[PDB]
Amino acid sequence: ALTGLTVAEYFRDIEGQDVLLFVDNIFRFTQANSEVSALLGRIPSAVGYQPTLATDLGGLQERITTTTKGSITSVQAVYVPADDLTDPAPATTFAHLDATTVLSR
Amino acid sequence: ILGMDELSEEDKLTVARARKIQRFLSQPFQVAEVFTGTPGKYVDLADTISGF
Amino acid sequence: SIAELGIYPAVDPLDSTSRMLNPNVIGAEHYNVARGVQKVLQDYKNLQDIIA
Amino acid sequence: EILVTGIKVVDLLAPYQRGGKIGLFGGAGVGKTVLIMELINNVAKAHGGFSVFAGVGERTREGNDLYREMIESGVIKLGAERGNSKCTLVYGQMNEPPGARARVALTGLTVAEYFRDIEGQDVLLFVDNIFRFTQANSEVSALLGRIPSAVGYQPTLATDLGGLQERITTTTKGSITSVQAVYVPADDLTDPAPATTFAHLDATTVLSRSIAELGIYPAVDPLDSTSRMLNPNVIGAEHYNVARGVQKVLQDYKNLQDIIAILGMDELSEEDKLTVARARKIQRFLSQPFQVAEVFTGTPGKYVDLADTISGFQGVLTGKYDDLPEMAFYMVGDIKEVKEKADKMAKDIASRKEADNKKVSEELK
Amino acid sequence: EAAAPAGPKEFTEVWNKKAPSTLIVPEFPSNYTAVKAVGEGQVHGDAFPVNFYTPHSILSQAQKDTVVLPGVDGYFGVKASHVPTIAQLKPGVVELHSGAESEKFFVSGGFAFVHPNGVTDICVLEAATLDQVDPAAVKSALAAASAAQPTDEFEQAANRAAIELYSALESAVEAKA
Amino acid sequence: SNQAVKQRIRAIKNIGKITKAMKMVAASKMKNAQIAVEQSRGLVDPFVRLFGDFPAVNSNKSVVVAVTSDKGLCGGLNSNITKYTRATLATTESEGKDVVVVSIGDKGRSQLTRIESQRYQLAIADTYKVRVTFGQASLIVEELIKHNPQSYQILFNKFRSAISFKPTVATILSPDLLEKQLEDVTGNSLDAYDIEASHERSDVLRDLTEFHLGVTLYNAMLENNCSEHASRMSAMENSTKSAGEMLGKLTLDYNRKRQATITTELIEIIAGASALM
Amino acid sequence: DVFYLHSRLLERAAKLSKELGGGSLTAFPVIETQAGDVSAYIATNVISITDGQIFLETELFYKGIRPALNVGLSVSRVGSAAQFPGMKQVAGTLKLELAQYREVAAFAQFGSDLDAATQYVLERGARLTEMLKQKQFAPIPIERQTVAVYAATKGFLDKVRVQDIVAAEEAVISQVNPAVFKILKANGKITPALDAHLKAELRKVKLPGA
Amino acid sequence: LVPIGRGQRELIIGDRQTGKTAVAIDAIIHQKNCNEQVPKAQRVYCVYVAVGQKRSTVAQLVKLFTQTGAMRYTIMVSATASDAAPLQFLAPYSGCAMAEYFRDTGKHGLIIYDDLSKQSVAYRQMSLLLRRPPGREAFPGDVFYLHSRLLERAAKLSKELGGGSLTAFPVIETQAGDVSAYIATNVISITDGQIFLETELFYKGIRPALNVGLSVSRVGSAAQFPGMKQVAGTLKLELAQYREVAAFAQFGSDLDAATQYVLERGARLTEMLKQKQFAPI
Amino acid sequence: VGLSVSRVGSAAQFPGMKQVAGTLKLELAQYREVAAFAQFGSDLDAATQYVLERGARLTEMLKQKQFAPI
Ligand SMILES: Nc1ncnc2c1ncn2[C@@H]1O[C@H](COP(=O)(O)OP(=O)(O)OP(=O)(O)O)[C@@H](O)[C@H]1O
Ligand SMILES: Nc1ncnc2c1ncn2[C@@H]1O[C@H](COP(=O)(O)OP(=O)(O)O)[C@@H](O)[C@H]1O
Ligand SMILES: [Mg+2]
Ligand SMILES: [Mg+2]
């Protein structure tokens, strides 16, 4: 997802564009970063995520912004684990989110 | 539970107004026209507010 | 819950499972009685929500 | 022997022992500092002995409030009349590092133990948040290289607290009446720091959050507060049967609340409606205004004597006051005053307005 | 002879003195009917309002020009400004004419009031049209009712009611057009 | 303690579908009983314009009938007319008269005894089990004429719409025990009519007020039965909300316990691993 | 020591004594809550540290009542008996008429039966709730805030139903004489001279609900 | 309902202040009343082990046992809350060793371990400070073996070994009626019967607050009074019929008027099993 | 049937089965809210009944005996 940021940051900072970035399943970004903390021997936080969950997300989500050159807008898909909005992976994600688009059956 | 023509004419005025709002939120897409036939519609912002 | 009612042996008649409960092992007149008894006991548990 | 506190729910249901250990169990904002300042107001002036207030890990603003309000009460005298003071304060408040908060309860007892052992008299020890003793040792224990116990506490929680609480006793040479506030974390009474404290106390006054959200103050859970003084050979059979009868209708009302939420009161038997009518009445009657809460509630506080508590709740159990509405029982002193308040409620529903003019609002006078 | 000035309007004012003030007055069946008896009008010349009722149906409530009612003295007919009448009806045929077209209900008995404002209020229990009666089993039970008369004085009346009902039912299937 | 909270979500979810089934069971029973309560409304109209409407008469003997339900998820319908019973049973007594209190419906004997147990003498129940018919309402009326009062009081809930059920007192005077005695002012109000009966006018009015008793009783327990289904519908709507509000608080409480036991089992695993490493 | 993290921080917000200069520091910690659960760990830690709370309900925020102040749960006991003397006169009735409004709305929100006495409470309660909701980035002086609640706990607003009460407030605070805000500011409280002067100015304001 | 034979370990489990000590104290006080009437061979000598309690609570119990006269037969082994964690871990075993004197020499013992749940917390303290690696709720692995070692010493011996017996009463405190806890589930597996005491039954008036549907005696009626083996079997069944008919009339839906008879009689029977404290019958 | 999904979906359905199972899953979906009201048979709505009886016609259709695939 940082390789996706870097391609979208070139269009923002060099091309000067209004870029869309689709992070398909931002939860799987959280889930993968939670595995690499567990493999690096770090003590898991509350429910079982990495201790650096808010800075693993916030490191990615803060590069998606508007600068004076252009903009990156991110439409990122959100999975809610166990249909629990108070789970720390959506709750940390929803602090960054500026809109929700709920698609319904 | 009760019936369609049971409730008031103003509550039926919303039902007629909501159902043609609930329909009007639909839109054909330009990327979907290669398998749906209906051409795509880019709808501008002022035309969305004034249309609603 | 079977023991608290006084049925002894307190065997859960639905949760007890055997591999001898195939019709080609114990015959059809033992298999259909066992599957018939379990159907009436399962239906009663779906009605015991509304009886109580 | 009983310690009369002037509080209705305390003196009825979980009465305090005069040389015993008393714990007020609370969950962050339910009212165990207002209750412990009310016991300082009611008990500690008619006690006639020395008091020690050990403030362990609580607010420094509250340490300044108690200190200033004891100077204007004459409990603390400054200057050359210092020897006529009745209270000594030991403060280890919540800005202190965790070593100071882990030991300031011990230097509050040492002042209380000197008056018990050497001076040989009756002390009142008020320890605000003895949980903060346990929590400060739990901040330290991680760095002493210990394997942590259950929820995350020290392995030595029960013996650290046990070694402190066993010093706070009444001996054969003197007495310590100890009231301790016990914080419960995240409103969890099964948390091991509240759960270990329960065995160390003669009277536990458990303050609930749901009782406080119904506006009932003191927010005492009547079916979770317990004394060892609730014994018919200690308080008498008239007191004991009222307390057990009050608890019986409050318990049977709690058994009904699942149906009253779903089906409503229309589906109850009228035998059970008399339960819900009575148990809503005594639930309001257990609340009372405090003389330390008048400065923010406006209502003046009521000391209710024990004889007025017992007779008042006995009337509601026998049925002598089923006439009165359930809001007449709310925030009143004794059963004389629910009749004083029910008369006012009836009178108001008649006289509400007709204040147009010929009052002091003339534009020239 | 006028000891109790009752009524719906009087009951409201006195019930505010004995009941709680929370409760509003109970309703009354006078608050649900708009048609009265002594209230002047409601004839309109030729066709007069006929309220032919049962417990289980409202069989007519529009206006007719004549009603042949089967009274206990005999069949009488009602025109628009008829005399006020409380008529107990035999088992017989109520004929509702509107003009050239007429509908013929056979009723079991039950009163018919003509009110002073020209409103006819037929009030019977079972009002079968003769189209849904069969003429076979009427005498199959009438022959049985012509045979079984014991000394039961309660069945003295119930068999008498059995005979006179089928006998009028015999005679009123014969003359149909 | 994570299965006790999970089995309560078992309870409240089954209740919230029982009470939504009973909401629409009562909703379909409200509609097919509205087609019977509108047909029956006609026949009460001639007897209230022939005999009038006189609730407050000074009867010597009265029979008051509070017709209630049989099943009791009605929502305070059987209590509002038990409350409206004594509101009219204290009102119309100005002289110390006999009153026989009757209840139609099994939920009436359990609530009228709470107010008048010394005047409660009859209990009709099992009425609405198959249906309500006029022959059934006739037999209930003939048991009410065994006692002969001077007046009858019928207390029932008038089914106006699915929302409002304004209760009614419907009064029937005994044929000349008070009935002609209240019309005869400067003549008579009944003497306008030409009586076409077999026997006397005092004899046809004996026939005519029993028929007026059986009609307004048949309407009463048909107005009340359709008012019962429409208050059970509003009661079983208020309990599916209460079983959805409770289910929502339990699911928030379950998710908090679900998150807490995953943290607790993980801290137990890391502590056991750090004790070995 | 996550309690000591916050407790040693918020303890520095003090009012100093006069030999230390008399200076002060007032703190506003913000705690985000998950699904309204106030009994979480960090939330209950800061409740044990701070002097009061301002609970902001999600359900009142969705109804448009903004600021969504949960009145039954929001406390300030150190700041009460330190507030505006004019506001302390009029808000005792405001807290009470809202205390009855929550208590009466606890009994019957759906139309079982409506008393005339309780529909005075739902008429006055919805009056004061629309009174207290204000819009963002425009804070009101305390003298314009006392008058607006004086115009609501008393009469002067019962004509407007519930809808134009937001427009009745600038109908009140702009049409009264702006000297009446100067005397209320400089005295601090509502003197009986200013009391019936302000009754007089509130009878000659023209209200949008007519 | 839950009768206890000689040589049977029986758990008294419940929440705090539900009457678990009062059941245990009344067993000790009643043995004094029975020891004055029986021959010398069948007299029960009680041992009360008080683990982790207050010292004031223990001094109230030896005051009660001296006043009742029960102290003539009672040993009071006291490991209070200020004692070292190895003194509270070891006090059940030291009291059982004093109680096994009577079992081994043909006499009858009665050991009461008041809060075995406080012994396990003191054993967790030593295990975690000896750096043994923790398990469930930080308890050591061998905490089942901690209590099964102790409770299996309550035996009824052969007539070759004297015929003596030792009857154990472990006391376990639960947290919110949570018998699914780690130490509580260990001891329910060890002991024969179980006397479950409830909080909502306690405040309803039913005290001794015995949950009759959850309380077992695995010895059963083989070791109960024959004058109640024929009487209480009616009482066990009529209370079993009392329970479900009280769950439905909690709602107030309908009445059968033949299930109302079993709701009337069991309400006498529930009221029959109530008892005052410190007066064993 | 409410919880068993297939993200591939009906693009790998047998055609012919796709014609008739597309309305099978709909008639069973409407049946699932109408199910557990089937203990009210004496109390009926007659359009709720048609989805109730057809919903039981279809769950009885999908039963099979093992080791005999079709
Ligand atoms: N059978 C009883 N009848 C009346 N009161 C009782 C009875 N049993 C206990 N009590 C009272 O209830 C209180 C709690 O009893 P007890 O001390 O025996 O509980 P416990 O289970 O030992 O609690 P803990 O050990 O947790 O303090 C005691 O004060 C006692 O006076
Ligand atoms: N007896 C009481 N009467 C009125 N209000 C009370 C009472 N007890 C508590 N409160 C309210 O609840 C708050 C709890 O404060 P405090 O007693 O300091 O809580 P804690 O238990 O956390 O120390 C008080 O500020 C007060 O607003
Ligand atoms: Mg405090
Ligand atoms: Mg104990």
mmCIF file of C-alpha atoms in Angstrom, chain D residues 27-29 57-61 94-98 101 132 135 139 183 185-187 209 213 284 295-297 326-327 352 356-357 361-363, chain G residues 1-4 7-8 11 38-41 44-51 53 73 76-78 80-81 103 107 117 192 196-197 199-200 203:
data_model
loop_
_atom_site.group_PDB
_atom_site.id
_atom_site.type_symbol
_atom_site.label_atom_id
_atom_site.label_comp_id
_atom_site.label_asym_id
_atom_site.label_seq_id
_atom_site.Cartn_x
_atom_site.Cartn_y
_atom_site.Cartn_z
ATOM 1 C CA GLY D 27 -16.528 3.220 39.941
ATOM 2 C CA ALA D 28 -15.200 6.741 39.029
ATOM 3 C CA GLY D 29 -17.847 9.326 39.586
ATOM 4 C CA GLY D 57 -3.608 9.104 45.233
ATOM 5 C CA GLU D 58 -6.667 11.314 44.852
ATOM 6 C CA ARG D 59 -7.079 14.898 43.686
ATOM 7 C CA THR D 60 -4.927 17.668 45.155
ATOM 8 C CA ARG D 61 -7.847 20.032 44.712
ATOM 9 C CA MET D 94 -2.289 11.626 42.326
ATOM 10 C CA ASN D 95 0.551 13.873 41.147
ATOM 11 C CA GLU D 96 3.052 11.915 43.258
ATOM 12 C CA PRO D 97 5.316 9.273 41.732
ATOM 13 C CA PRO D 98 4.210 5.667 42.309
ATOM 14 C CA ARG D 101 1.529 6.713 46.529
ATOM 15 C CA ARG D 132 -4.279 3.622 44.625
ATOM 16 C CA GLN D 135 -2.208 0.442 41.718
ATOM 17 C CA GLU D 139 3.233 0.314 38.468
ATOM 18 C CA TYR D 183 -12.142 2.448 43.464
ATOM 19 C CA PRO D 185 -11.680 -0.111 37.666
ATOM 20 C CA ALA D 186 -13.902 0.035 34.574
ATOM 21 C CA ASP D 187 -16.869 -0.603 36.940
ATOM 22 C CA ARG D 209 -23.424 3.565 38.432
ATOM 23 C CA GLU D 213 -28.102 7.397 36.636
ATOM 24 C CA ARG D 284 -36.418 6.639 46.234
ATOM 25 C CA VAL D 295 -23.264 23.458 47.939
ATOM 26 C CA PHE D 296 -23.930 22.058 44.461
ATOM 27 C CA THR D 297 -27.431 20.588 44.634
ATOM 28 C CA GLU D 326 -43.296 7.802 44.291
ATOM 29 C CA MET D 327 -41.668 11.212 43.833
ATOM 30 C CA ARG D 352 -49.255 27.387 39.315
ATOM 31 C CA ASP D 356 -49.696 39.039 36.153
ATOM 32 C CA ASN D 357 -49.140 42.332 37.985
ATOM 33 C CA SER D 361 -42.350 44.950 38.922
ATOM 34 C CA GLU D 362 -43.989 48.378 38.564
ATOM 35 C CA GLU D 363 -42.112 50.589 36.085
ATOM 36 C CA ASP G 1 0.992 3.635 34.896
ATOM 37 C CA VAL G 2 -1.331 4.904 32.193
ATOM 38 C CA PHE G 3 -3.316 6.477 35.012
ATOM 39 C CA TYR G 4 -0.171 8.257 36.202
ATOM 40 C CA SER G 7 -3.015 12.214 36.400
ATOM 41 C CA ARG G 8 0.396 13.807 36.663
ATOM 42 C CA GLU G 11 -2.874 17.858 38.083
ATOM 43 C CA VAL G 38 -18.025 5.382 29.404
ATOM 44 C CA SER G 39 -16.863 2.455 31.536
ATOM 45 C CA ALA G 40 -13.762 1.873 29.435
ATOM 46 C CA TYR G 41 -10.312 2.021 30.992
ATOM 47 C CA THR G 44 -12.798 6.101 33.649
ATOM 48 C CA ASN G 45 -9.231 7.055 34.496
ATOM 49 C CA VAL G 46 -9.710 10.641 33.343
ATOM 50 C CA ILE G 47 -13.112 10.840 35.066
ATOM 51 C CA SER G 48 -11.272 10.000 38.293
ATOM 52 C CA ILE G 49 -8.781 12.799 37.595
ATOM 53 C CA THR G 50 -10.861 15.667 36.239
ATOM 54 C CA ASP G 51 -13.484 17.699 38.080
ATOM 55 C CA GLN G 53 -17.436 15.955 32.351
ATOM 56 C CA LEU G 73 -24.606 13.096 32.892
ATOM 57 C CA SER G 76 -19.268 20.600 36.885
ATOM 58 C CA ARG G 77 -19.195 20.786 40.659
ATOM 59 C CA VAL G 78 -16.057 22.855 41.046
ATOM 60 C CA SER G 80 -20.722 25.703 39.902
ATOM 61 C CA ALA G 81 -20.684 28.381 42.610
ATOM 62 C CA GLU G 103 -38.089 12.517 33.791
ATOM 63 C CA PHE G 107 -42.524 7.951 31.332
ATOM 64 C CA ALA G 117 -49.523 19.200 32.958
ATOM 65 C CA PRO G 192 -34.438 44.105 40.451
ATOM 66 C CA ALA G 196 -38.406 44.381 35.235
ATOM 67 C CA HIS G 197 -36.600 46.546 32.711
ATOM 68 C CA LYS G 199 -39.328 42.095 31.364
ATOM 69 C CA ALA G 200 -40.253 45.349 29.631
ATOM 70 C CA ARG G 203 -42.541 42.321 25.794
#
